[PDB]
Paper text:
MINDY1 and MINDY2 are members of the MINDY family of deubiquitinases (DUBs) that have exquisite specificity for cleaving K48-polyUb, yet we have a poor understanding of their catalytic mechanism. Here, we analyze the crystal structures of MINDY1 and MINDY2 alone and in complex with monoUb, di-, and penta-K48-polyUb, identifying 5 distinct Ub binding sites in the catalytic domain that explain how these DUBs sense both Ub chain length and linkage type to cleave K48-polyUb chains. The activity of MINDY1/2 is inhibited by the Cys-loop, and we find that substrate interaction relieves autoinhibition to activate these DUBs.
Despite this distance, we found a water molecule to coordinate T335 with H319 via hydrogen bonding, an unusual mechanism that may serve to orient H319 for catalysis, thereby adopting the function of the third catalytic residue. To test whether such an unusual catalytic architecture is possible, we introduced a T335V mutation to disrupt this water bridge, which resulted in a substantial loss of activity. As T335 serves a catalytic function to correctly position H319 for catalysis, we wondered if mutating T335 to a negatively charged residue would enhance the activity of MINDY1. H319 is locked in this conformation, which is further rigidified by the network of hydrogen bonds with Q131, S321, and N134, resulting in the catalytic Cys being rotated away from H319. Hence, the mutation T335D also forces the enzyme into an unproductive catalytic state, thus highlighting the requirement of a water molecule to bridge an interaction with T335 via hydrogen bonding to correctly position H319.
Numbering used by the authors: 110 to 181, 185 to 369
Write the structure that this text describes.
């Protein structure tokens, strides 16, 4: 029934902290969330441990969510947020559709999976922002979600009115041209947004990655099983829109294979 993953043991806050690794590059965000908790020393693993099941990671997470004492804001809601988190807890192992909005980097269509993040105080961000410098598209896309833009693009193909068939393409364009779901305007907004040395989760091309700002740059944790052995390789810059990027030790210093 369950999947296995290997554990990179790295020195974090000068203490031998575990992290979870995956070559598969799967869409499920269990590892993205979990890695954060491990870093935050909320979940501790026996030094010796080499491998971990989903069923373990899950149970560790369950305990964590149920262990959250409230702290005032949503009060009836908090209890529903827990029950919501708890009910969609299994869907985390599997994989998760994500309807992004293009309206800003913390903007998604709510699914009850969002409740897990909200509870653990983990921000979720995406890179796919429409550029106000293309007001043609800004207007065409408007305050609309991704899976919604597709519905409407299709609606617009078949529409008689050629005001729509024009916008139907004005949008078909914006997606044709932003295929890697991280526009420049995205990166800028996303960097500015994310708090200095705060652990967040970064969504893009149906993968979840663990994020932080550090000395006003964005780095992502190095989940790639590929560098299992390499204690020195932990953060990979998200400095460029696409291309090349420098690896670093847990202190955000350069490191080489």
């Amino acid at each position: 029934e369950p999947d296995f993953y290997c554990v990179k043991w790295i020195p974090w806050k000068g203490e031998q902290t575990p992290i979870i690794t995956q070559s598969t590059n799967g869409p499920c965000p269990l590892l993205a969330i979990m890695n954060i908790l491990f870093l935050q020393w909320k979940v501790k693993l026996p030094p010796q441990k080499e491998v971990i099941t989903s069923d373990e990671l899950m149970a560790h997470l369950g305990n964590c969510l149920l262990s959250i004492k409230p702290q005032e804001g949503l009060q009836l809601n908090f209890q529903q947020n827990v029950d919501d988190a708890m009910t969609v807890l299994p869907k985390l192992a599997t994989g998760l559709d994500v309807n992004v909005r293009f309206t800003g980097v913390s903007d998604f269509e709510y699914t009850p999976e969002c409740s897990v993040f909200d509870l653990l105080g983990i921000p979720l961000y995406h890179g796919w922002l429409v550029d106000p410098q293309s007001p043609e598209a800004v207007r065409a896309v408007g305050k609309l979600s991704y899976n919604q833009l597709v519905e409407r693009i299709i609606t617009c193909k078949h529409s008689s009115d050629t005001n729509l068939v024009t916008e139907g393409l004005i949008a078909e364009q914006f997606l044709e041209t932003t295929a890697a779901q991280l526009t420049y305007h995205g990166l800028c907004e996303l960097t500015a947004a994310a708090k200095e040395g705060e652990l967040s989760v970064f969504f893009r091309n149906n993968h979840f990655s663990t994020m932080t700002k550090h000395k006003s740059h964005l780095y992502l944790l190095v989940d790639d099983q590929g560098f299992l052995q390499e204690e020195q390789v932990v953060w990979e810059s998200l400095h460029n829109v696409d291309g090349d990027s420098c690896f670093c030790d847990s202190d955000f210093h350069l490191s080489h294979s």
